[PDB]
Symmetry: C2
Subunit: 110 residues, 2 copies
C-alpha cells in the first residue's frame, strides 16, 4: 500500500554520479520522490514537457538554477519549476536531500 511511506522500509535506487532516489507515494495526479545527493553531485539541467514540479530542500544545501536564475537554497527552502522551465541543481554538502513533487505522476518512475 502506498498510503504510508516508511523511509526505513524502502531501499534506494542508485542513479549514479552521487545521486540516489526513492519513489515515495503517488496518485494519478500527484507524486512525491526523495532524492539524495553527495557533496558536489550534479542534478543535470532538464525540463518537463507536461509536469509541474515543486522541490523541498529537506537537508543540506544546493545551488539551484532555473531558467538562468541561480540561487543557494538550504534545508527548509523550496523551488518551483513549471512545465518547460529548465532546472538543475548542484549539491553543496554531503547528505543533501530534495523532496520532489510532481503533477501529474511521473509514469517513468514506476
Amino acid at each position: 500500500s502506498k498510503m504510508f511511506f516508511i523511509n526505513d522500509e524502502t531501499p534506494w535506487e542508485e542513479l549514479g554520479n552521487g545521486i540516489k532516489r526513492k519513489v515515495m507515494t503517488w496518485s494519478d495526479d500527484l507524486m512525491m520522490v526523495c532524492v539524495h545527493f553527495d557533496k558536489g553531485a550534479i542534478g543535470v539541467a532538464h525540463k518537463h514537457d507536461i509536469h509541474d514540479q515543486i522541490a523541498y530542500v529537506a537537508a543540506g544545501s544546493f545551488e539551484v538554477e532555473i531558467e538562468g536564475q541561480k540561487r543557494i537554497l538550504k534545508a527548509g527552502d523550496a523551488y518551483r519549476a513549471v512545465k518547460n522551465e529548465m532546472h538543475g541543481a548542484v549539491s553543496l554538502e554531503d547528505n543533501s536531500i530534495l523532496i520532489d513533487t510532481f503533477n501529474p505522476k511521473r509514469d517513468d518512475f514506476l
Copy 2:
C-alpha cells in the same frame, strides 16, 4: 516571485491550537505548504472533496490516522490521502513539521 521559496524570508500564519503554516509556492495544479506543530498539537480529522494530498514529515514525529488506520511516522516518512479520505494527525514532539502537497492548488490558502 514564487519561483524560489526562502523559509527565513517568509513569516508564519498562526492557526491557533499549537499549529502555524506557510504557503510556500504553487502553480494551478500543484501547491506546497509548511505546517509546524507544537508537542501534542492536533490536526483535526478532515477530508478534501477535490484535492489529493501527500504529506512529508520533515521534522519530529506524528501519529497519523487515515480512514481508520493509525501509524506513527517520523522525519523522512510520508503519507497520502486521496480525495475524500479522512485524515488527521497528532504531533508527538515539539517543532514537528509536515510539508503538505496538493493537487490542484488550495484556492482557500491564497
